[PDB]
């Protein structure tokens, strides 16, 4: 007599709710969006195959204009890039050179030791930035790589070096006087502050003793 029009209206609704749930459902069964951290890595990988004008000892501004400025000028406190990209935080992030920072990957040697692919670990032990010379973050780290996958012996050489904001490259060498081991070069041109293309070198000639693509943690 009264609910004769309502008893069904609530039904027309209880209806929509279902025709929708059967949608929100068919939705989840669809690949989600990709973490921006992924796209970033693509734009990187790609940007690395594209041609680049900056000559050795120079790196391009992170701005919209691919201007080239000398490595010795990034993060020195004075706007050197046309837009100042050489000084914005996203560039001078110390995120990489933070004490305790550690990067590892699987080292596959191609020139200085029997060793079959083993784990390499370059980790930062201390690092200061001289107040008047910001361009470089002088630091110290350790390079460790497994020896015998069975008894787990492992080599640990101490290193010294710095981190170049421009090239976004970590350059470490042995401390001088400790079995004259190896050095290591890691490029973080991979897009973010946690992935790098490291290569164990021979301090003397920076000749590649082995290579290992590293991740952070």
């Amino acid at each position: 007599r009264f609910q004769y029009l309502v008893k069904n209206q609530n039904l027309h609704i209880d209806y929509l709710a279902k025709k929708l749930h059967d949608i929100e459902e068919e939705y989840n069964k669809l690949t989600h969006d990709v973490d921006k951290k992924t796209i970033r890595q693509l734009k990187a990988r790609i940007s690395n195959l594209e041609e680049h004008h900056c000559d050795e000892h120079e790196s391009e501004c992170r701005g919209d204009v691919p201007e080239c400025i000398h490595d010795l000028l990034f993060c020195d406190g004075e706007k050197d890039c046309r837009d100042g990209s050489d000084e914005d935080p996203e560039t001078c992030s110390l995120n990489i050179t933070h004490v305790g920072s550690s990067y590892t990957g699987l080292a596959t040697w191609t020139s200085c030791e029997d060793l079959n692919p083993d784990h390499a670990i370059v980790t930062i032990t201390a690092a200061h930035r001289k107040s008047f010379f910001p361009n470089r973050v002088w630091l110290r780290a350790t390079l460790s790589y497994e020896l015998d996958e069975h008894d787990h012996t492992v080599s640990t050489t101490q290193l010294r070096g710095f981190y170049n904001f421009g090239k976004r490259e970590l350059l470490l060498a042995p401390l001088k006087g400790q079995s004259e081991g190896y050095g290591v070069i890691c490029d973080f041109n991979l897009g973010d502050d946690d992935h790098a293309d490291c290569k164990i070198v021979v301090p003397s000639s920076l000749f590649v003793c082995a290579h290992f693509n590293a991740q952070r943690y």
């Binding site: 609704i13 939705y27 969006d33 790609i46 195959l49 004008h53 919209d64 204009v65 691919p66």
Partner: protein
């Protein structure tokens, strides 16, 4: 509690759903966000440029999951030459009369003023009714120079065309110094194009400016 509370329950529920509805309509629009499309498609292009050429020197790639090469002289001509149709579905002229583009220098080894900026004003643009593949343009290249001995301003006018074939506008040399501009569009952007200043005859690049549409 009867004709009062049972009527405001079949209402506060109508909305309780009208929300969950538009809530999804949003999540959907988020994956169709055109701004995301071009931005991603744009990225695709950068890659297409690194890959070996998909088609011969003077041919247009129609893309898709089934590629087909047709002559560049067919892109936007009025005839459906490609199976998929690409050669005819994207024929919007970017640099059209009234539009202005500001270029930021970043590598200048030839311009007479080695200027910091360089404005590009499009005066007129007309397409020949029978040859849609090319739109003819008339442009004024403005420049604000300033030295010690003087302070000059320039607005050299030049003819030019835009080829839908490869989203590349060629601006014929303004001054009789054999220097012309050649900007090739992203394909999906249209609010930013790299502008190369070259020697028409040679086709030598000697000046790069990133042009942004002044909006």
């Amino acid at each position: 509690q009867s004709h009062d509370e049972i009527i405001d329950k079949l209402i506060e529920r109508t909305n309780k759903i009208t929300t969950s509805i538009s809530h999804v309509e949003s999540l959907l629009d988020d994956r169709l966000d055109p701004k995301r499309i071009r931005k991603a498609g744009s990225l695709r292009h950068r890659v297409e440029e690194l890959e070996d050429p998909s088609c011969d020197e003077h041919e247009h790639q129609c893309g898709g999951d089934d590629p087909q090469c047709i002559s560049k002289l067919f892109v936007c001509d009025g005839h459906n030459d490609c199976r998929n149709g690409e050669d005819e579905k994207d024929c919007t002229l970017p640099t059209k009369a009234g539009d202005k583009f500001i270029g930021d220098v970043c590598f200048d080894h030839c311009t007479k003023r080695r200027p910091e900026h360089m404005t590009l004003a499009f005066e007129s643009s007309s397409i020949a009714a029978f040859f849609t593949p090319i739109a003819d343009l008339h442009v004024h290249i403005e420049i604000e120079s300033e030295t010690d001995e003087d302070e000059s301003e320039v607005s050299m006018p030049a003819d030019g065309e835009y080829s839908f074939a490869d989203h590349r506008l060629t601006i014929h040399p303004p001054e009789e110094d054999g220097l012309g501009l050649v900007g090739e569009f992203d394909g999906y952007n249209f609010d930013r194009f790299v502008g190369h200043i070259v020697h028409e005859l040679s086709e030598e690049v000697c000046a790069e400016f990133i042009f942004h549409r002044k909006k």
